[PDB]
Amino acid sequence: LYRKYIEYPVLQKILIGLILGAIVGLILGHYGYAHAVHTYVKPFGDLFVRLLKMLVMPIVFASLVVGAASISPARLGRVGVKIVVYYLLTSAFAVTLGIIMARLFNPGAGIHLAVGGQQFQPHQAPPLVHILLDIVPTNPFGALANGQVLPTIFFAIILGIAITYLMNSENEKVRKSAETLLDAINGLAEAMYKIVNGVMQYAPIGVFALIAYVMAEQGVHVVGELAKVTAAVYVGLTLQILLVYFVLLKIYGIDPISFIKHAKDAMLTAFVTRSSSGTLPVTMRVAKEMGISEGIYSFTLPLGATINMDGTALYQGVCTFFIANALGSHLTVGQQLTIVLTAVLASIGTAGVPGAGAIMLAMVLHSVGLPLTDPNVAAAYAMILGIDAILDMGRTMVNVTGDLTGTAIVAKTE
Template sequence: MLSWYFKTNLLVRIIVGLILGVVVGLIMGPQAEIFSPVGDILVRSLKMIVMPVIISTIIVGAGSVTPSQLGKVGAKCMGIYMLTTAFAVVIGLFYGNLFHPGKGLELAAGSVTLAPIPFNETSFWDVLIMVIPTNPFQAIAEGDVLATIFFCISMGIAISILRHSEDERIKNAGDSLFYLFEGLAEVMYIVIGWVLEYVPIGVFALIAVVFGSQGAGAFGPLGMVVCAIYIAFATHVLVVYGGGLLFFGVNPIVFFRKIKTASIAAFVTRTSSGVLPISMEVADKELGVDKGIYSFSLPLGATVNMDGTAIYQGVCALFIGFAIGEPLTFNQQMTIIGTTVLASLGTAGIPGSGAIMLMIVLNSVGLDVTPGSPAALAYAMIFGIDALLDMGRSCTNVTGDLAVTCAIASSENEINRECWSNISK
């Protein structure tokens, strides 16, 4: 009976759910609150998968990088990828603070309590120290995101060292642990797929509640979010990538012209991992990068380089803070930078992963997205337009993978300059 639902494109279903939620909310007004339990199911489902996703994907991501790859080229890749991700979230926070998306929504009006935000009296150095957990199991149980990420990265690197030991017994132990977490990651991808099937229904319910209480006034803040994020995307691509390429002796204008096939494919498909074969073809045929460089840097970038997603985290976190009347403090914004850079090491390059990562970032700054809370309503508004934002951030991610790959190849003199002699390509 429901085959028509599951056979319909997920993006189409989410858009239909968003539109229906807006219409029903405007028609029913405050009575749309009756849909709140339907939306709460989506929020609880997303919270259910957060910690398992962090643990499995980050350990697998860190465990996939071999010790030998952490040499000169590997260090350059990791260093530049993490640096550009930090720049990306800073740019996102800059435009978020500039545009103030969500300000005036007052989603917390009439609410009894708000989620506690514990950073007002905590120094930045205290936050850095608290990244190291005294009890990792307690950190996982309590949802301490930064501490959990730090522990998982450390564990993943240690597993990688075990897997490449010359002692067969130790190597087998490392492989067993790696495959265990890899299996858990694959299981979580399936569970994520199930949750995403429910997203259109949950989005309909939550958006209906928002527009039922806010009316047509909710359109402006959502438009401001889209505007701020896409301006941030353009700034990051032109300034960070363009400037970085110039620094490494690469013509950015020619570069952007040559990678258009991969960038457009990422924009349409909304996945950076899915267009990896296209990216590798572009790096080989169009950019003239040596296979030894791009065969390592591009798969690594599809796992750890999430600049578009980082921009999204910065703007959307500020939107939710403004929307519930609790603008994020400086220390909270610094925490967002740290969480985003670390969490990007295991974020899957698949459609919808940015919205799940946003839940992780919100938890790290005390914005607990509990069912029925103002933060949950603001989060639902973001989820409703996530597909539109996902296209831009996937395109930015893939552009960044190729930019870093080209820059590193140029610095190592592993690039065929003959491919650049005909700039009309």
């Protein structure tokens, strides 16, 4: 009965769906019915993911415009600098943890692989100059038309600042025009939040299908060295959330366990969707219910979804460690690690692409000098691809958790 289903708490529904989907997907993958899953159960998950993508651009644009108009530029710049510093600190912690856990688990140590089979088109990290320029869109409508949250963020910020400057003008009609535009945008944002509530009510079905498909496809592949890689990555995410995020929340006076009861929706939606940008409407909704101001979270969360290096730090460290050992070259000489990190940071250019995990890894390996055309690199990269989605699940989870933690910290500071 529909009324009973809706009346049942969403959090309980989400957990039940996630667990049941995990179990069913694992069973079907073990018994070899993965194709049946990918054919009949997978589409339901994509519907939820597609709904979240649909809400991504409108909600981000409207909420950021409203928040920028609501707060002065001086506060917005301070918030941006603070959240950038927070992301740098958390990224340092995340790379430390990634190195530590990769060394602890020693994945792919001396396990030879067969050359041949699947071979991939190499990938190269976008040039830094191009990425910086793309922050300014040549066409704001085009940026809204096709993804590109980052230039949308810039246009939203400048439009909000212009609107708030206009509202302080001396021409009555100009004030009326600015107020009407801001009210229309605010109405759009609130409508997006209501649609987020509806999509969240639908989510239990979507989360179930997503996790079921992911499990059936790849959880059977989590065995041997790959199992070590997955364990290292997930232990890294847990240590991040427990040492960096929780300690930061406590040091800034935000209770973590109470913060989890709020971030649960964002964390699990990020987990299943495997895309921080895609799950943004839920994360922004969570920040709103947290009481965080519009001008702060509406800027930090969309920004973090593209520059949060916490998840990609652990993923890249652990995987690149696995690739090295798999090739047999235990040595990744010194500054080559710094090259990896710098190329990773430039990998924000692939934000929102479905293959976030593998693509970034391909770019990082190419930057190191291990292009995927190398047959030995091809086998290890294919191995990682065998569990890409499972790793990306947790990567997105930690990324969104860190985005919410930084947003909460900045909101408390301001």
